[PDB]
Design a protein around this ligand. Structure first.
Ligand SMILES: [Mg+2]
Ligand SMILES: [Mg+2]
Ligand SMILES: [Mg+2]
Ligand SMILES: [Mg+2]
Ligand SMILES: [Mg+2]
Ligand SMILES: [Mg+2]
Ligand SMILES: [Mg+2]
Ligand SMILES: [Mg+2]
Ligand SMILES: [Mg+2]
Ligand SMILES: [Mg+2]
Ligand SMILES: [Mg+2]
Ligand SMILES: [Mg+2]
Ligand SMILES: [Mg+2]
Ligand SMILES: [Mg+2]
Ligand SMILES: [Mg+2]
Ligand SMILES: [Mg+2]
Ligand SMILES: [Mg+2]
Ligand SMILES: [Mg+2]
Ligand SMILES: [Mg+2]
Ligand SMILES: [Mg+2]
Ligand SMILES: [Mg+2]
Ligand SMILES: [Mg+2]
Ligand SMILES: [Mg+2]
Ligand SMILES: [Mg+2]
Ligand SMILES: [Mg+2]
Ligand SMILES: [Mg+2]
Ligand SMILES: [Zn+2]
Lengths: 81, 44, 135, 60, 122, 193
RNA sequence: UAUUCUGGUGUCCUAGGCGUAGAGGAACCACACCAAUCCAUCCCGAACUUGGUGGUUAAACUCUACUGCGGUGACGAUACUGUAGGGGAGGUCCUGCGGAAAAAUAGCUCGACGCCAGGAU
RNA sequence: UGGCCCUCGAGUGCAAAGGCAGAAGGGAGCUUGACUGCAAGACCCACCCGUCGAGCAGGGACGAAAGUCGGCCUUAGUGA
């Protein structure tokens, strides 16, 4: 009949990208369903928020064959130039 | 077979046909009185 | 008059017409054809009139395919209606054609009767067109 | 209406003001459907005072 | 949809294996039971390595106990003991039990109980 | 007028021997030879026989259900299962979980015994019998035959029966083709067409 | 130390899948058969369970092969576009410098790699 | 009720979207973590609100054990 109702954009989507740095607890992704699956060193939340357990670089992978998973690996920062 | 819930299956059932025939079958009764059966039937 | 039997939403985006139709390009049913040269919107009424004209002028000639169809709805607000309070009422239906698109196909006449017929058909169209022969 | 706020309460809690370290009467709160289940709800739940998982009944 | 016993049990093994994960400090104890043989393994999944493996196909239990057709509870107990000793001799105490798709019961259960009495922790 | 039930009446006989040992002694060499299979295990075996009663009106009155259950029991020596309807069905007045039919599965030895009591007892003691349809196979070598009423079996005592209640019987077999299943059934004494 | 084969067990991946044809029984894996005190079926020793037999590669799994299907997939060119302009009443067209598909065909594909036990050389 | 073929097209209290096949879908057994005390760090952000949470102690549930459990596949169901 008559329209005009809508909703504030929920702020979903990838918060940290590939090969960036993550603290522990830091949120990597806020998603509706699971568009990404938890990999290693990484916890999943009730709303399927994916968050880090470890300091380090976050990397996206092929869960296989189709889906995608995110995981965090520890890096080494020695090369101070 | 689970116990007490099944009707007792008596393994020995003697088939007594009125041609004084006696066979063995099995079923809950011990004997079966039969006037009409496979052998000695209208067809064949 | 051609038209879809059902849609969920009534009202629809004007859209935008760009480029060339690559797919409707070939002439795969008949022998002679009428090809769209320019990017336009064809009402079902126009297609009706074109087909009718070509059919009546061919007559003793056999076959006419219509390679298009008016599946996109179009909406209008009435006269003395102030702007606002909702999108208007769908009045008619258009087919979106882009240059290169084949409109009419025809078979069962000599090339002359076909040329004359297709010309009279093109007369009822909103667009510039072309006469083309099968390869 | 048919769905209700119900108060769960420790059965082994003595309101008299007890002599132990922490005195008080544990109550939880929760909702019940008073149509579906007319049974007065019983639930084992933790009591901060008794320190043990006690049994909490209901209140009228 | 696999109703072949084989594929079915495999399905179960994988399902179980979702939760139970071999780590350096908690190696996975993996039980395989076939018609004529009992085979057990110990795996650290990070390193992807088997630390210790005891089986009925080893001379120890062959010369100890013989059986006619199916492996007995006795057989199993013997194996649990062998792996308990073998693992306690490499410095492996704390482990997690992968029941490998077989219901925990019978010789599986007995295997577990044997390895518990002998100082392996799970 | 070809008689394979002169094999089933032939001499004073025993149960276990009849079914299970006519299978291993007689049936298997026969099938082995006439179809020429290149290993023994390719022989068609009787896997299971499920009997299914279809009565939806009995869901209205559960006493009818209990009665029919005990009847099927005394017939088959097995206390049945009461099958629930999965979906809400309007035209038949059924909602989910409602107990619709009654079903039993007979496996192993009881399958053979009940098969015997079928062919050699109740099938002749039926109403006007001709022969069972050769065309009731499903194409993969599993057979199905209906029983309009259960007065067929002697365990069912006809005067104590409240109402006539129907039964369905599905023989399931490792056979992949209907020829092999047919030879199996008829060799075992079944009355075809 | 090698190599080969069986069974277990994983990780990587282009996700190695179906089909047709072939191979495997000494060992190994499997079914087959038999009996039911631990346990087991809303009914059924079917499954799951304990204890025997000694049959068979039929099914299963396994190993080799093959483009029929399936899966994967370019180079080029075109569509589109970033920026600098130009034409058209407009719908929209065109140029220069930069990026660059989808589809389709040509090809590719009948996985890769590791540990353990057990034989064989 | 029996069986063969297609393999995710059903379902998930209720909209729609995104999820989810040996499952988040269907069943069974035992329950009350629909806990007390908290919390590194994050997201969202005018403010006010809102969301995620590793980890720690207490006292438990299930489980042989590893472990999981601070309501519910997620996002509405609210009021300083
Ligand atoms: Mg939104
Ligand atoms: Mg949680
Ligand atoms: Mg262009
Ligand atoms: Mg014109
Ligand atoms: Mg065995
Ligand atoms: Mg590839
Ligand atoms: Mg490849
Ligand atoms: Mg074979
Ligand atoms: Mg190909
Ligand atoms: Mg292809
Ligand atoms: Mg290119
Ligand atoms: Mg440009
Ligand atoms: Mg420009
Ligand atoms: Mg360019
Ligand atoms: Mg370039
Ligand atoms: Mg590309
Ligand atoms: Mg492509
Ligand atoms: Mg290979
Ligand atoms: Mg919905
Ligand atoms: Mg959906
Ligand atoms: Mg579930
Ligand atoms: Mg926690
Ligand atoms: Mg912890
Ligand atoms: Mg705790
Ligand atoms: Mg306990
Ligand atoms: Mg749930
Ligand atoms: Zn208290």
């Amino acid at each position: 009949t008559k329209n005009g109702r809508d909703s504030k954009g929920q702020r979903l989507g990838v918060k940290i990208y590939g090969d960036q740095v993550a603290k522990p607890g830091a949120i990597i992704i806020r998603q509706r369903g699971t568009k990404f699956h938890p990999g290693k060193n990484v916890g999943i939340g009730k709303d399927h928020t994916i968050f880090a357990l470890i300091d380090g670089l976050v990397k996206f992978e092929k869960y296989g064959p189709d889906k995608k998973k995110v995981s965090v690996y520890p890096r080494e920062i020695q090369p101070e130039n | 077979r689970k116990s007490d819930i099944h009707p007792e299956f008596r393994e020995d059932a003697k088939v007594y046909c009125n041609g004084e025939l006696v066979m063995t079958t099995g079923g809950t009764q011990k004997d079966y009185t039969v006037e009409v059966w496979s052998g000695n039937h209208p067809f064949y | 008059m051609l038209s879809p039997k059902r849609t969920r939403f009534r009202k629809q985006h004007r859209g935008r017409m760009k480029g060339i139709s690559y797919r409707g390009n070939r002439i795969c049913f008949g022998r002679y054809a009428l090809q769209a040269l320019e990017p336009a919107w064809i009402t079902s009424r126009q297609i009706e009139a074109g087909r009718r004209a070509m059919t009546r002028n061919a007559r003793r000639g056999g076959k006419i395919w219509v390679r298009i169809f008016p599946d996109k709805p179009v909406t209008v607000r009435p006269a003395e209606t102030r702007m606002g309070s909702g999108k208007g009422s769908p009045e008619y239906w258009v087919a979106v054609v882009k240059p290169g698109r084949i409109l009419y196909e025809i078979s069962g006449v000599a090339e002359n009767i076909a040329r004359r017929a297709v010309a009279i058909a093109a007369s009822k169209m909103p667009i510039r067109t072309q006469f083309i022969i099968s390869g | 209406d048919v769905r209700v706020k119900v108060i769960l309460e420790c059965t082994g809690c003595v309101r008299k003001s007890v002599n132990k370290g922490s005195r008080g009467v544990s109550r939880y709160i929760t909702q019940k459907n008073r149509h579906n289940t007319p049974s007065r709800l019983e639930l084992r739940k933790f009591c901060p005072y008794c320190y043990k998982h006690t049994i909490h009944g209901e209140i009228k | 949809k696999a109703h072949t016993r084989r594929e079915d049990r495999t399905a179960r093994h994988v399902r179980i294996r979702k939760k139970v994960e071999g780590t350096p400090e908690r190696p996975r104890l993996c039980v395989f039971r076939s018609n004529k043989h009992l085979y057990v393994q110990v795996i650290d999944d990070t390193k992807m390595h088997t630390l210790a493996a005891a089986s009925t196909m080893q001379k120890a239990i062959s010369e100890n106990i013989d059986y006619s057709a199916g492996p007995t509870v006795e057989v199993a107990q013997k194996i649990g003991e062998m792996i308990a000793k073998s693992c306690l001799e490499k410095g492996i105490t704390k482990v997690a039990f992968d029941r490998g798709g077989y219901p925990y019961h019978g010789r599986v259960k007995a295997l577990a109980d044997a390895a518990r009495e002998h100082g392996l922790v799970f | 007028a070809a008689g394979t039930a002169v094999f089933v009446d032939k001499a004073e006989a025993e149960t276990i021997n009849r079914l299970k040992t006519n299978y291993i002694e007689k049936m298997v060499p026969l099938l082995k030879e006439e179809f020429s299979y290149s290993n023994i295990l390719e022989v068609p075996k009787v896997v299971k026989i499920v009997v299914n009663c279809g009565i939806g009106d009995a869901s209205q009155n559960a006493k009818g259900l209990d009665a029919a259950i005990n009847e099927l029991a005394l017939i088959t020596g097995q206390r049945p299962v009461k099958t629930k309807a999965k979906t809400s069905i309007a035209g038949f007045k059924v909602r989910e979980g409602m107990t619709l039919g009654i079903a039993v599965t007979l496996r192993g030895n009881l399958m053979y015994s009940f098969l015997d009591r079928l062919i050699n007892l109740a099938l002749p003691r039926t109403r006007d019998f001709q022969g069972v349809n050769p065309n009731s196979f499903d194409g993969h070598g599993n057979y199905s035959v209906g029983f309009r009423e259960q007065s067929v079996f002697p365990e069912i005592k006809p005067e104590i029966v409240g109402k006539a209640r129907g039964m369905d019987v599905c023989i399931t077999t490792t056979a992949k083709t209907d020829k092999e299943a047919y030879k199996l059934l008829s060799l075992m004494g079944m009355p075809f067409r």
